[PDB]
């Protein structure tokens, strides 16, 4: 498609994370609200989760179990709420200042960037080891992206580019893009084609594995973009962060 359309949630300040779960629930942190609110697919009315004492969500990821996993800017914690039960748990991470992207691969590790350490961390569910992934040389990284593979994307907000280690991978690899621009939103689909939000440049560009040409998506009117998410379909959403609104493009 070439014409995105606009979900219609209600209310939203400032917003800048999205998620969407296989049955096309989208999950948007509505960070000028301090809020977290999804919309079911075909809905007009939206829902407030219930996380409880968070301190502005800078970032959400959502799992197979549709856990739904969110970044604390004030608490600089990464909480996690189980479907079903509402039960809130905060991810036993340390060290952790401004974590700000979040992702979630297909073993349930749970990957962070660290925005004020300038530093990746990865933690399994249910452990109390976490990990500093080898990037190097980061400054003020924004989002994380994994894929099938455990293949980790980073965008270096700061340089301007958008980083990727390969599972077991000693050294960082950074994607061709083009022209990148305080780049901040990140995901990868299920055939480990990348889609960044290219900031800076009110875009959202995207790279399929193994080629040199980004194609910059049909977007319109994007103003200060932020999260971007991609469902099985192929369709992409990202939270216009500047308009206070969420726009979906399908493949």
Known sequence: SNTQT???FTGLNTPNGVAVDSAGTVYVTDHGNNRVVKLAAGSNTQTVLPFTGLNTPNGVAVDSAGTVYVTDHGNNRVVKLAAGSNTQTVLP??????????????????YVTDHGNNRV???????????????????????????????????????????????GSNTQTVLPFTGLNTPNGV???????????????????????????????????????????????????????????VVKLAA
Request: charged share 10%.
């Open 93 to 110: 991470f340390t060290g952790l200042n401004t974590p700000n992207g979040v992702a979630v691969d297909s073993a349930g590790t749970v």
């Open 6 to 8: 606009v979900l219609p």
């Open 187 to 245: 995901a990868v689909d299920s055939a480990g084609t990348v889609y960044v939000t290219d900031h800076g440049n009110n875009r959202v560009v995207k790279l399929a594995a193994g080629s040199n040409t980004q194609t910059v998506l049909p977007f319109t009117g994007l103003n200060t973009p932020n999260g971007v998410a991609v469902d099985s379909a192929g369709t992409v959403y990202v939270t216009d962060h500047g308009n206070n609104r």
């Open 121 to 167: 961390v990865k933690l399994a569910a249910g452990s109390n080891t976490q990990t500093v992934l080898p990037f190097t040389g980061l400054n003020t990284p924004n989002g994380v992206a994994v894929d099938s593979a455990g293949t980790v994307y980073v965008t270096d907000h700061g340089n301007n580019r958008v980083v990727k280690l390969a599972a």
